[PDB]
Amino acid sequence: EKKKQQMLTGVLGLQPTMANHPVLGVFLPKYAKQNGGNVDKTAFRLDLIRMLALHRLN
Amino acid sequence: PSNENTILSKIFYFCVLPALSNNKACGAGVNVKELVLDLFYTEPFICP
C-alpha cells in the first residue's frame, strides 16, 4: 500500500479523491509492479493520460 | 506507406510544398516533454 501511494504521489501528486477513480483504482496495482525499475516517471504520466482518455469516450 | 504512398509523400515534400513555398518554409520539432507537462497541468482535476 505504501508503494501504491508513493507511486500515486510520484505520478502527479494526485489527491486520494482521484485515487478512488476507477481508472486509477484498476491501474495503480499494475503501476505497483513497476517503477521499482529505472523505467521513468514521465512514462507513467503519459500512460495515465492516454488511459484516462480511452476511458472517456462518450 | 507502400510504394504508391511513399512516392506521393515524396511528391508533395519535394515538388508541391517547395515550389509553392519558394524556400520560405521552416521545419523542426516542438519539445517532447513540456507537452506532457501541459497535459499534466490539465489532468489533476477529475470532477465530471
Swiss-Prot record, chain A:
Example of a GO biological process term: viral process
The keyword tRNA processing is assigned to this record: no
Cellular component per GO, a single term: host cell nucleus
Compartmental location: Virion; Host nucleus
Transmembrane segments: none
Keywords in alphabetical order: Capsid protein, Host nucleus, Virion
Main location: virion
Assembly and interaction partners: Interacts with the major capsid protein/MCP.
Family: Belongs to the herpesviridae small capsomere-interacting protein family.
Function: Participates in the assembly of the infectious particles by decorating the outer surface of the capsid shell and thus forming a layer between the capsid and the tegument. Complexes composed of the major capsid protein and small capsomere-interacting protein/SCP assemble together in the host cytoplasm and are translocated to the nucleus, where they accumulate and participate in capsid assembly.
Protein name (Swiss-Prot/TrEMBL): Small capsomere-interacting protein
Source organism: Human herpesvirus 6B (strain Z29)
Whole-protein residues included: 26 to 83 of 89
From Swiss-Prot, chain B:
Compartment(s) of residence: Virion; Host nucleus
Similarity comment text for this entry: Belongs to the herpesviridae major capsid protein family.
Described function: Self-assembles to form an icosahedral capsid with a T=16 symmetry, about 200 nm in diameter, and consisting of 150 hexons and 12 pentons (total of 162 capsomers). Hexons form the edges and faces of the capsid and are each composed of six MCP molecules. In contrast, one penton is found at each of the 12 vertices. Eleven of the pentons are MCP pentamers, while the last vertex is occupied by the portal complex.
Assembly and binders: Homomultimer. Makes the hexons and eleven out of twelve pentons. Interacts with triplex proteins 1/TRX1 and 2/TRX2; adjacent capsomers are linked together in groups of three by triplexes, heterotrimeric complexes composed of one molecule of TRX1 and two molecules of TRX2. Interacts with scaffold protein; this interaction allows efficient MCP transport to the host nucleus. Interacts with capsid vertex component 2/CVC2. Interacts with the small capsomere-interacting protein/SCP.
Protein name per its UniProtKB record: Major capsid protein
Originating species: Human herpesvirus 6B (strain Z29) (HHV-6 variant B)
